[PDB]
């Protein structure tokens, strides 16, 4: 079993790099974080900030989530973010992703005590 907090860290946290290096970034990252083990994760986002900074977003701007839940938070400043999406020629187990790097505000859902990110809603 894996806690929600831990799953968010695995799926969305990447403080090792300051941004998406190349176009293959999303390919090897979706792999190293085990997001291609049993299925190709269609869409996934990586935040290139310190965990501390991402966790802090749980105390930033409270916004609604796409699903309507009122526990989403948007970061006051922009963050280095990498979006990963399957390309047209992506088929399990040969997943292929388009890596798109940018700096936008991250929006996550927080819950529990300690109150930390447990899901990544979107990035604006």
Tell which one of 36, 45, 74, 123 touches Cl ion (CB under 5 A).
45
Q: Which of 8, 46, 73, 120 binds Cl ion (CB under 5 A)?
A: 120
Catalytic annotation on 119? yes
Q: For residue 115, how far is the Cα from the chain centroid?
A: 17
Q: Which of 8, 9, 11, 12 is catalytic?
A: 12
Q: How far is the CB of 57 from Cl ion (least distance, A)?
A: 12
Give the torsion sign (CA, 42, 56, 28, 123). positive
Contact 25, 99 (CB under 8 A): yes
Cα-based torsion angle of the residue sequence 110, 105, 18, 2 in order, rounded to the nearest 10 degrees: 20
Length of the chain (residues): 124
Q: Count other C-beta atoms under 10 Å from residue 120's C-beta.
A: 22
Q: Is 44 in the site for Cl ion (CB under 5 A)?
A: yes
Say whether 104 counts as a known binding-site residue. no
List the beta bridge partners of residue 122.
107
Q: Is 47 annotated as a binding residue?
A: no
CB of 123 to Cl ion, least distance (A): 8
Taking the least distance from each CB to Cl ion, the nearer of 52 and 68 is 52
Residues near Cl ion (CB under 5 A) are 44-45, 120
Which residue ranges are tagged as binding site for substrate? Answer: 7, 10, 41-45, 66, 85
The set of catalytic residues is 12, 119
């Amino acid at each position: 079993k894996e806690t929600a907090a831990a799953k968010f860290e695995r799926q969305h946290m990447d403080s090792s790099t300051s941004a998406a290096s190349s176009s293959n970034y999303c390919n090897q990252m979706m792999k190293s974080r085990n997001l291609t083990k049993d299925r190709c994760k269609p869409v996934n986002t990586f935040v290139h900030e310190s965990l501390a900074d991402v966790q802090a977003v749980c105390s930033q701007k409270n916004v609604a989530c796409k699903n309507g839940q009122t526990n989403c938070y948007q970061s006051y400043s922009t963050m280095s973010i990498t979006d990963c999406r399957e390309t047209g020629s992506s088929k399990y187990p040969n997943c292929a992703y388009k890596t798109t790097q940018a700096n936008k505000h991250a929006i996550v859902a927080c819950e529990g005590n300690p109150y930390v990110p447990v899901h990544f809603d979107a990035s604006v």
